[PDB]
Amino acid sequence: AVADKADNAFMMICTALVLFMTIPGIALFYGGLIRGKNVLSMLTQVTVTFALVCILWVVYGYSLAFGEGNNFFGNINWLMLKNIELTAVMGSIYQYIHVAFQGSFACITVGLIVGALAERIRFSAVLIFVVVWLTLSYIPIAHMVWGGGLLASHGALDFAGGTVVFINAAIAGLVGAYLPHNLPMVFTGTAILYIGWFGFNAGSAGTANEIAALAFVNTVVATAAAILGWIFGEWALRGKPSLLGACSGAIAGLVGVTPACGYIGVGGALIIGVVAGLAGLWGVTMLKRLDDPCDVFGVHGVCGIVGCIMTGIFAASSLGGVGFAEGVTMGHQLLVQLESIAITIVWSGVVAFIGYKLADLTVGLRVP
Amino acid sequence: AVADKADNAFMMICTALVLFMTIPGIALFYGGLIRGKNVLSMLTQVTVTFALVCILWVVYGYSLAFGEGNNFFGNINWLMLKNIELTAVMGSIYQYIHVAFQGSFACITVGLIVGALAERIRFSAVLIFVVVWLTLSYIPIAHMVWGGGLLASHGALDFAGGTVVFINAAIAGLVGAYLPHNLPMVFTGTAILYIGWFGFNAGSAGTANEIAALAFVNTVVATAAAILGWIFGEWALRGKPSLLGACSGAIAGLVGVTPACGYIGVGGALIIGVVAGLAGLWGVTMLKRLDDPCDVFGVHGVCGIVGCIMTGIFAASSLGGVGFAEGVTMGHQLLVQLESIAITIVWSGVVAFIGYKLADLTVGLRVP
Amino acid sequence: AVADKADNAFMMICTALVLFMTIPGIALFYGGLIRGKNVLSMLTQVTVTFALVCILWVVYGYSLAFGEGNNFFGNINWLMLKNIELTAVMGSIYQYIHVAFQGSFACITVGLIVGALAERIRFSAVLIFVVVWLTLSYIPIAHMVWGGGLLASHGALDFAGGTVVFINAAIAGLVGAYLPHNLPMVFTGTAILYIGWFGFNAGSAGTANEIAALAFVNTVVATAAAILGWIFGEWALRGKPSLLGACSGAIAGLVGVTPACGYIGVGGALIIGVVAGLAGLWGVTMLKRLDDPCDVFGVHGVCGIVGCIMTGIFAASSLGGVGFAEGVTMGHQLLVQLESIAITIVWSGVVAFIGYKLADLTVGLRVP
């Protein structure tokens, strides 16, 4: 197996774009939503936990997520990338690039949680939580879905992380919750998220081929459709569109197309986008009957679930998708999508609860 | 014809960079120029019309612009990208990438108009206008210049859209007009525009070859030269440089080098940049004797015209350019540049007028 | 020698990312640190001197830095890129791309100085200074290290410019000095710097190969480690982390890994990051006993020195690096690193002093 330089180039740039989603994307997104007096602290927690995740990833995370192990985790053979030769190839790129690309997904996932909960959680408590939850939730679930584990070996479809990233983070954040002064800044973060998301979705093909291209176009289309879907629902329910509605719409479509983007046709991307924008609206509306920043987990959670379900529909050849695996009916894919979603919800929740409680028992959770 | 992965990678990244020009580039540019109390509304109109253009593009826009038809429009054979095989190649990249790249130019074009006029126009009126003007102006003109239509078949030179994007948008905006509180934000948008513009200009080569490289370097050089040209004129006329002058200079050179970048030598890029920065200054100065945000169409319009004229000069081999087509004197290229510019001005204006009047007759134009 | 399109693509995108570090990265970084009433002026000086450097680079800078000459400068054979054929290849990319990539390093270097000193220096004095110092300091030092000059011909290691960019700029700025109201904005600039830095460090390989990949990953790792190192020192010395501490940490690791990134293992990147974050903290702490914006040269200078020294340690094969050149002991590399650092400090200082004094004698240095 030889590395293709075009894929290497593509995937390093894609990694830079996913890192850009956290630093500064998600930080500016939450920075505009949360209370002014809490912005500096939130930006500090996002920056430090990001650093933390980068280090844990290289030390053991990548190895435990992508080494070969069992159905649930990999191994410790790649501690500090030990035994990965510089010229080792994975797919059609150098494995070092795979390490960085995958680590960038871990970072955005943690960013989604910390940016929202930063306001309410002690600093040392967030560090502890991030260590427990990245290690016992993000990593096994990344392993199950993308590392040849349980869900993969049953043919779950999740191109860029509807489960691993969004449902996973939404549940961890909502357990957290259970336990806007600057809209131009919200818009800027949304914009940075949108752009970085082309690396997230297209780079998820692992190569600059026709699947990256499909994912790119489906990203443009689902995002746009979700913006219109959300804005129309807002105009119908609230009388007029709003900037926050526009940005929330964009996030709803981005998140909804995430598991599907590399499997569906542009027709499907359009339908998924409209449904995700409306379901996102319905979702935050319901969450707002329990404020602001954690309602965002209503978008990530509901849109992730919807997107995951609808991947199992729109991948079908007859609906313009790339087609299910041989011998797989749409019914079977649906069942497998639902099982993947349930395992993620339950796995992430249990580990989140343990994470928050461990922190609470060591340093105390609620910021003093 | 087989896709080259290097070109695929390059052109997906270039597309992400052109999308970044609208979201958030042009939005932040206008956001800093217009009245504080109007910023949220403008950001909403830019976000929603952007979404709108993405959807119209995939549904019929691309097909009508790039399908084969007549001198003025393509066809409806590619409705929702029907009959484009996933692996279809166009040039040396997958056609799906061509769709996304071309659509991103439609988006920035509409962004230029909406960002300026958002303040003064009813929301539903802007949606109607965008539908009419994208469909009857952007698409035929894209078809005439880049889709093998009238102007192309006469050898018009316009590497990245001096006519299709800038003169086209300037005229539509100025008809609109006829019918700064945050300079750090203006600067940020200009900066985002500049960076995204490397994808706009370099990606316009369709491949990561020596023409992309020429376009890249000419972009650096024209922008810089226009900044100095504008700043010197300001120092001479107003006594000192200003930040807005600096940013306006950068836009003047970017817009002026747009039609020329892939055809000229760095010597020509320097000359075009100085002339565009000075003509831009002269232009806004004149427009300011008819405020702020629409004066920007003086830069887009005057610089686009200047850049289009000067492409027909500096493409010449003897002036360091790549050379005119065989059998084409500089005189002939000039005549063809001028004819292209006139057709664009007149075509865009007529359709803009119809667009605004249709809206005015349905929902009413002036924001209530 | 034929151009590889994958390398061409990679290196054009990398160039766009390094330009993004100056416009708007460093501008927003200083914009948040300096006095509110001085922001507009600083943004203007950064934008205009950036333009200035782009023009000088194409006119003679590139030629004098990368043409063949002597140990200290190149030649004037490439004036305005004369005699570089469009299809000329350098390494595995078109030489025009090499011109743009190298010019982008000149730009960020000047940005580091001007962004800090803008507050205190007359506009015309900064233009004069930039002309003298780019020409007699940046160019010879770029030539000595990367253009086959003195330091290169002794085997100095400096992957992406610990000397040419950071120590060089720190000294020029500190001579300048001798002669925060918006932390969200500081954070945004730091974030833009971090992301653009992947082009800076990875593109410094000149190709999308396994060395780019190593540089990418080492960038992620050193940055993150430096953030934790700085934050821990702050928590230990000041009682709690701060946002400015977080951002300063990130810059410390970025700057420290700059000379090393393509030569070291991830283990070394981690160690270099922790040491650079702590040394950066120690450094600004000492500089703050001589305010704010020039203390940043304590990060660039101290971290650059540390990173340069530690390249001569961690490149060793036994410490996971790519290995010293044949026949070179670690001791010898160390001596050569130290000599390179001394020459840079002394060369840049002497030329800075001449630059500032020439300006002072023509227009006067201190802003009126």
* Domain range list for chain C: 1-368
3-state secondary structure string across C171-238 = HHHHHHHHCCCCHHHHHHHHHHHHHHHHHHHHHHHCCCCHHHHHHHHHHHHHHHHHHHHHHHHHHHHH
Question: Is C159 exposed, middle or buried, given 0-12, 13-18 or 19+ CB atoms closer than 10 A?
Answer: buried
Taking each helix axis from N to C end, the angle separating B243-257 and B183-202, rounded to the nearest 10 degrees, works out to 10
Q: Please give the resolution of this entry in Å, rounded to 1 decimal.
A: 2.1
Contacts of A365 (CB under 8 A, 6+ apart): A121, A122, A125, A179, A356, A359
Q: Which amino acid is at C303?
A: C
| Contact yes or no for C253/C283 (Cβ under 8 A) | no
CA B351 to chain centre: 17
Q: Are C81 and C326 in contact (CB under 8 A)?
A: no
Of the candidates C57, C20, C14, C3, which has an alpha carbon nearest to the alpha carbon of residue C199? C14
C124 carries a ligand binding annotation: no
CB distance B306 to B268 below 8 Å: no
**Per the CB < 8 Å rule, is C223 touching A51?**
yes
User: Cβ(C49)–Cβ(C114) under 8 Å?
Assistant: yes
Instruction: Determine how many CB atoms are found less than 10 A away from the CB of residue C68.
Output: 11
Distance, in Å, from the CA atom of C28 to the CA atom of C41, rounded to the nearest integer, reads 13
Query: Chain C residues with CB-CB distance to B under 8 A?
Result: 3-6, 8-9, 12-13, 15-16, 19-20, 23-24, 27-28, 31, 39-41, 43-44, 47-48, 50-52, 54-55, 58, 80-81, 86-87, 94, 96-97, 99-100, 103, 123, 185
Tokens of A177: 């919750």
Q: Looking at the partner chain, which of C28, C47, C100 has a beta carbon nearest the beta carbon of B220? A: C100
Nearest to C100 among B210, B216, B242 (CB): B216
Which of C294, C313, C306 minimizes the C-alpha distance to C341?
Answer: C306
Assign residue B45 a region (left: φ > 0; alpha: ψ between -120 and 50; beta: otherwise): alpha
Query: Beta-carbon neighbour count of residue B237 at 10 Å?
Result: 11
3-state secondary structure of B285: helix
Residue A95: both structure tokens together: 């494995």
Question: Does A224 contact B94 at a Cβ distance shorter than 8 Å?
Answer: no
- Separation CA A81–CA A67 (nearest Å): 11
Give dist(CA C254, CA C266) in Å, integer.
Answer: 14
Q: B348: burial class by Cβ within 10 Å (0-12, 13-18, 19+)?
A: buried
Which positions in chain A have a beta carbon within 8 angstroms of at least one beta carbon in chain C? 3-6, 8-9, 12-13, 15-16, 19-20, 23-24, 27-28, 31, 39-41, 43-44, 47-48, 50-52, 54-55, 58, 80-81, 86-87, 94, 96-97, 99-100, 103, 123, 185
Tally Cβ neighbours within 10 Å of residue B366: 10
Q: Which residues pair with A93 in a beta bridge?
A: A90
CB–CB contact B54 A250 (8 Å) = no
Peptide bond into C368 cis (omega under 30): no
CATH number of B1-368: 1.10.3430.10
Rounded CA-CA distance C104/C18 in Å is 6
d(CA A9, CA A13) in angstroms, rounded, equals: 6
Supply angle C-alpha A2, A202, A157, rounded to 5.
95
Taking a C-beta distance cutoff of 8 angstroms, is the pair B301, B168 a contact? no
Q: Which of B12, B26, B50, B97 to mutate to test the interface with A (most CBs of A within 10 A)?
A: B12
Is B266 within 8 Å of C31 when comparing Cβ atoms? Answer: no
Considering only CB atoms, B103 lies closest to which of A7, A183, A220, namely: A220
Distance, CA of C208 to CA of C184 (rounded, Å): 34
Cβ-Cβ contacts under 8 Å for A170 (sequence gap 6 or more): A112, A297, A298, A300, A301, A304
Nearest Cα residue in chain C from A98? C213
C316 in helix, strand or coil? coil
Phi then psi for A94, rounded to 5 degrees?
A: -60, 135
Q: Are B344 and B144 in contact (CB under 8 A)?
A: no
Q: If you measure CA to CA, which chain C residue comes closest to B202?
A: C12
Task: Verify whether the Cβ–Cβ distance A48 to C227 is below 8 Å.
Answer: yes
Helical residues (DSSP H) of chain B, grouped into ranges = 5-20, 27-33, 39-56, 62-66, 95-117, 123-133, 139-146, 168-178, 183-202, 210-238, 243-257, 266-287, 292-314, 330-362
Of C184, C188, C220, nearest to A54 by CB-CB distance is: C220
Count of CB pairs separated by less than 8 Å, A with B = 141
